[PDB]
Design a protein around this motif. Sequence first.
Motif, short mmCIF file in Angstrom:
data_model
loop_
_atom_site.label_atom_id
_atom_site.label_comp_id
_atom_site.label_asym_id
_atom_site.label_seq_id
_atom_site.Cartn_x
_atom_site.Cartn_y
_atom_site.Cartn_z
N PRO A 1 0.83 -1.20 0.00
CA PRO A 1 0.00 0.00 0.00
C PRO A 1 0.86 1.25 0.00
N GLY A 2 0.32 2.29 -0.64
CA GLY A 2 0.70 3.67 -0.36
C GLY A 2 -0.11 4.14 0.83
N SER A 3 -0.17 5.45 1.01
CA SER A 3 -0.78 6.00 2.22
C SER A 3 -2.28 5.71 2.25
N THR A 4 -2.70 4.99 3.30
CA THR A 4 -4.06 4.50 3.46
C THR A 4 -4.61 5.00 4.79
N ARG A 5 -5.80 5.59 4.74
CA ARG A 5 -6.43 6.18 5.92
C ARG A 5 -6.81 5.09 6.91
N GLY B 1 -3.95 12.61 -5.32
CA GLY B 1 -4.25 13.65 -4.36
C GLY B 1 -5.12 13.26 -3.18
N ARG B 2 -5.32 11.98 -2.94
CA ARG B 2 -6.08 11.54 -1.78
C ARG B 2 -5.43 10.30 -1.21
N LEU B 3 -5.67 10.08 0.08
CA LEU B 3 -5.34 8.82 0.72
C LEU B 3 -6.29 7.72 0.25
N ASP C 1 -0.83 2.64 -4.76
CA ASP C 1 -0.34 3.83 -4.09
C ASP C 1 -0.87 5.11 -4.69
N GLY C 2 -1.91 5.04 -5.53
CA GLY C 2 -2.36 6.22 -6.23
C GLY C 2 -1.32 6.80 -7.17
N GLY C 3 -0.29 6.03 -7.50
CA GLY C 3 0.82 6.47 -8.31
C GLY C 3 2.01 7.08 -7.59
#
Lengths: 249, 250, 249, 249
Positions: C179-183, C212-214, C243-245
């Motif tokens: 994962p990238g940044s995950t809430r 631009g978002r978690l 990771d949303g890129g």
Amino acid sequence: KRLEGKVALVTGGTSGIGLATAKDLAAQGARVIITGRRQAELDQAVAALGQGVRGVRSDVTRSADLDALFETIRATEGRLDILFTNAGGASMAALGEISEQHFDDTFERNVKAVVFTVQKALPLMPQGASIILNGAIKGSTGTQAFSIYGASKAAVRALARSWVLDLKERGIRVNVVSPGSTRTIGLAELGGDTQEGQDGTLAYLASLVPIGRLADPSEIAKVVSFLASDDSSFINGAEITADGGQAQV
Amino acid sequence: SKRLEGKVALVTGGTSGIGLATAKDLAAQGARVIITGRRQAELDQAVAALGQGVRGVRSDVTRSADLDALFETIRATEGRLDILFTNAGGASMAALGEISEQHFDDTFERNVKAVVFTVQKALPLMPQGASIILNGAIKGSTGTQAFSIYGASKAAVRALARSWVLDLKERGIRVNVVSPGSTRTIGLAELGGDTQEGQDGTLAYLASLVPIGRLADPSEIAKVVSFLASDDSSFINGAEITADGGQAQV
Amino acid sequence: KRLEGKVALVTGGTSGIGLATAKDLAAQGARVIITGRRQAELDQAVAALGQGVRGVRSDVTRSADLDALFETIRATEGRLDILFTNAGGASMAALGEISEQHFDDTFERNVKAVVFTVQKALPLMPQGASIILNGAIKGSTGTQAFSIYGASKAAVRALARSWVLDLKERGIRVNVVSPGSTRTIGLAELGGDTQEGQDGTLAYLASLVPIGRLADPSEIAKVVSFLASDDSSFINGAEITADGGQAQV
Amino acid sequence: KRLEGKVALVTGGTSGIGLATAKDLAAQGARVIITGRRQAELDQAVAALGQGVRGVRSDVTRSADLDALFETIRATEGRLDILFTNAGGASMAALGEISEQHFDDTFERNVKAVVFTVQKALPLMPQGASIILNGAIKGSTGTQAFSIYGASKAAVRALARSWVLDLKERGIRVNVVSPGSTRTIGLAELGGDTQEGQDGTLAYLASLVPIGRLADPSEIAKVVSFLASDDSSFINGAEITADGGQAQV
Ligand SMILES: NC(=O)c1ccc[n+]([C@@H]2O[C@H](COP(=O)([O-])OP(=O)(O)OC[C@H]3O[C@@H](n4cnc5c(N)ncnc54)[C@H](OP(=O)(O)O)[C@@H]3O)[C@@H](O)[C@H]2O)c1
Ligand SMILES: NC(=O)c1ccc[n+]([C@@H]2O[C@H](COP(=O)([O-])OP(=O)(O)OC[C@H]3O[C@@H](n4cnc5c(N)ncnc54)[C@H](OP(=O)(O)O)[C@@H]3O)[C@@H](O)[C@H]2O)c1
Ligand SMILES: NC(=O)c1ccc[n+]([C@@H]2O[C@H](COP(=O)([O-])OP(=O)(O)OC[C@H]3O[C@@H](n4cnc5c(N)ncnc54)[C@H](OP(=O)(O)O)[C@@H]3O)[C@@H](O)[C@H]2O)c1
Ligand SMILES: NC(=O)c1ccc[n+]([C@@H]2O[C@H](COP(=O)([O-])OP(=O)(O)OC[C@H]3O[C@@H](n4cnc5c(N)ncnc54)[C@H](OP(=O)(O)O)[C@@H]3O)[C@@H](O)[C@H]2O)c1
């Protein structure tokens, strides 16, 4: 020194990274041949280098020019120990504005010219010669409006992996130097026609490097010299990235 | 030829193999070298064979007190460290379903934990413009049966360098990684088995996997470290330099 | 119902990615077991999930807990088709302030516990079973004060490459979701105990994602569900990055 | 019916991976458009798929053919939710035998046509659309006589990294499926015209995979369907490698 007694060809040797590399290799005692399209820059480069550096006006994208260039190496030196396929460039185009010309121009010099420069050089290169390709960190990253250049640089790095096996019998090792942001005429031109435009563009690019500065071209050249030297004897197919940590973080 | 003259280098695990050759090449470039090993006898032979103002300290990188002792000696004897090569390491084999807690703890304590605290303890001595070289492996980026723990420890070492680039930006110390392929070493030979015929078939087999078809001489790995130790690597930071004869590159 | 009848274990299933993954796996028909160290949170998680989700209070770092948990699966379900070694965490320490406890705790949970969860699970796993390791983009990137976490996550991904060959006879495939940044509760806790500090840190982290978002944990859970299903039959030892890129650029 | 209500275009949909993907995409409810150069297979492909799969005879390398193809999509379906740039191929030439045509042919189809397939499609693609490019493990590996093919595939992967930033305002996410050795007509054809020559190469290729078998084209197709679905909403610029662990090991 280490490169003394060796014959080196640097395509695109008349300015920037190719220039600094030709200087460094020659300072190690190698016989260096440099190429450029513009006669004036080539003459200034040969005069500035001195030290038995030979200049040939050639276009890496013209197959006949490559044939003529290697004929001069065969006629004079008779061998090529070091090859640095530096001649290349970047242009910017976002997706939705990519012209067929923009694509073809980038790939022909950055990729096709690399393939046929190398293929033509081979009959001159003895066992244990070293080939260095010029990659980029943009080959391993994404930047807006840089997709075509980035793809070409990735293609360059990919060539070295297969060529390890193609050249295993001939005993030539092929490696890639992937520079980060290096202070050159070419990098400055991306900033614009204006002097603030190039000055502000170089400053923003410096702000992206973790150590916080652009590379001097000599710092890339040291990496090429290392790969050209016998110290790289166990390095094959590898990518050496000098980016101040930009793509490493 | 006096390329690194006037610089102080520390090679952990300097008494054999890649660490030994690296200490030799650094000294041949004019560096003052400190080497460490666990066995006093090999350490004495290594210091004697190197000569050239090479200082030896018997210390185990896994023992925190030894690390404190070693850096205290550097602080009094030379007073600074300009080059650090965290070479001390080893490989052991255990397939999934045969992995012991011993086997995990030993591999990660030497290969990873000792690397962290060797580096952390060396920071006060290191001046702006110093160079740190960590010892990785292509096995950190590849898969081999019974090598998951070793390969994982080697991946961790490479990852440490990426974050340490940012942690060390203010001090000006750059961290890079050399990832060797199969290099002839007692360590590598001993992996083949403990019998003499068994080590040769392992060394020949490992050579057959290399595309250029030969094992590395330890000196060829060492040249990469010296380049990284020298000022020529000034724009290299956080990078991994792989010398494997192309094995992991293909 | 891609997972109908399959038995899945999510370690650390009581919060965040592990919780949403357990919710998603059960919604596809899997029988899910979740584990957590805290009895209260675990009971709340089981009640909220419903759908035949079973909770076991166990610590991945305690070998005896690992034995007891798998004994319950052998006694209850009788096999394990899907394993998600989710239980993990991040902690911050810059070089020069790294304590032995900070290293040991990170590697015990993030690496060692992953190893022995997998090895102890194997006797229940039939041919064609799916193992999913929880990586991170921090395993391949550099962030200040995150070297220890970054190294542990890189170690996780490397384990998968060799485990391909170790498990080839057994027929189990091992893959990694990074994962990238995950809430999640865990990520917010890095932002601080105050809500305003969590708001500024999460918004900052969102600014780093190119989209631009978690991520919501459900978006990570879909990657795990895909790896657990038979659709991943040709994926082995691979890393799938959601990771949303962020690390892809 | 996850993809129901969505319009998918697969270039090279008449055989192999593109055919299996067209089958899988349609089985999820998508309206699929497939393209091929040969009318016969394109007719056989459209009839065999049924399920309202529409065929267009088009060459990805012909700019005019591309224009017409998207005009029919705009005239008929009116929008494009999924793009799979599958049409591509490999040919072998070792260094010293690389023809300029062989380079141009490889880069036309595998890279240039991909660039302009994507660029022409963009006006049809709504926010939240998914683009899947077809890579290969050879883009990241080295094989004797495969340098140009591998270099083309490495360029495809690099395109997605920059395209993440170029398409962020549009909200279209770009990902890459990189197959390993997959049982197709194209793969068999590399073993040459002789029948047992094709069988002998395919079993050899199966021996190189860690799981020891070639992929069925459906196993690659599942990966594409996943990326096309909303389940991949947090995946961007990523490469998903389904190779049986070959490049992972
Ligand atoms: N600078 C960077 O930050 C950076 C980063 C990564 C990679 N690179 C790569 O490094 C290489 C050198 O870049 P640079 O910044 O040093 O560029 P530069 O300052 O523009 O210098 C380019 C040199 O190549 C010559 N050249 C250009 N096109 C040529 C052609 N078709 N045939 C022969 N010679 C040619 C130029 O002379 P003429 O114009 O007279 O031919 C000049 O001597 C390129 O491949 C570039 O992509 C640069
Ligand atoms: N050789 C390869 O093919 C290869 C490939 C990839 C990576 N590497 C890495 O390269 C490094 C050197 O490997 P090698 O093959 O040269 O090994 P080697 O031949 O076994 O030499 C290891 C050296 O490290 C010392 N050492 C071991 N444990 C130590 C400890 N706890 N504290 C201090 N010194 C210690 C040994 O001396 P004592 O035994 O007396 O302590 C010896 O001087 C290791 O990190 C290894 O993982 C090697
Ligand atoms: N969130 C992100 O942005 C992100 C990014 C990359 C990777 N990851 C990884 O994703 C995984 C889950 O992270 P998260 O953000 O969802 O974390 P989280 O919200 O803190 O949830 C962690 C879960 O694991 C359990 N747990 C922790 N240690 C355990 C242990 N020793 N034994 C058993 N259960 C344990 C926790 O419950 P108890 O406290 O009750 O035991 C909880 O259920 C971790 O491996 C993390 O490194 C997260
Ligand atoms: N098979 C593998 O193991 C493998 C591995 C890695 C990557 N890949 C990649 O996967 C993709 C599909 O390969 P494949 O094995 O499925 O190939 P295949 O069996 O040869 O099928 C190729 C399909 O593309 C069509 N096509 C070819 N050139 C075209 C053009 N210029 N314009 C439009 N359609 C065209 C073909 O029809 P026409 O010939 O009639 O045009 C056919 O429908 C390629 O990009 C390939 O490089 C395949």
